[PDB]
Amino acid sequence: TGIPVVNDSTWDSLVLKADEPVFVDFWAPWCGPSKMIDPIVNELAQKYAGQFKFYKLNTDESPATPGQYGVRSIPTIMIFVNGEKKDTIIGAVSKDTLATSINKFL
Template sequence: MMATRTSSINARAPTHRAIRPASSQKTHRRSLLCRAEDTQTSAANVVTDATFEELVLKSPVPVLVDFWAPWCGPCRMIAPLIDEISNEYGDKLRALKLNTDESPSVATEYGIRSIPTVMIFKDGAKLDTVIGAVPKSTLVNAIEKYL
């Protein structure tokens, strides 16, 4: 009885889906690419293999390091959150971004196996790690423990 009922429901359900015209698809794809490009980091908040020790380990304030890559969708999702946190905490916290494709040594040293990964450092020591695209509140809770 159940199989007959299910098949009759499926028979009434529409099986088509809306397809965008080719010109609309190109525009949509272009806008997605433009949004992804907007997440590029400025030189002011970038850390590399060469600058990691100076900017992170020797920092007089706690440092939040976002390990990311340009091809990573979840990384692009949390990028604006990292920028907001940087602006909100001002001088109490330094927020930096490390591109794991361009600076693989530090990522390897700290065992980064998944991105995005956010680590919090204070006085040269790694204190906390948050893995994945998490809500801003999760990052703030992790930060607040060390301020």
């Protein structure tokens, strides 16, 4: 069980057109550090429920969006507000690092 998925088909409607700030987790199953963040992304999604949307994009399954947005390594977190990219947090970082960035858009 984890956060909902976004893919290339739904990127515009779920991320760019969202009512709420959005946290996006770029990950892939070949990258173990990008999977090891799932418990703290899930903790964040529960804590921030109703203030942020949370989605994960599998760069193996949805290659167009990471290509377009210049993703070079995973995990990569991006935050969007009203259609605008507001932050990028690259690499397997602490929950506190992520909460700092999330709270900036609260």
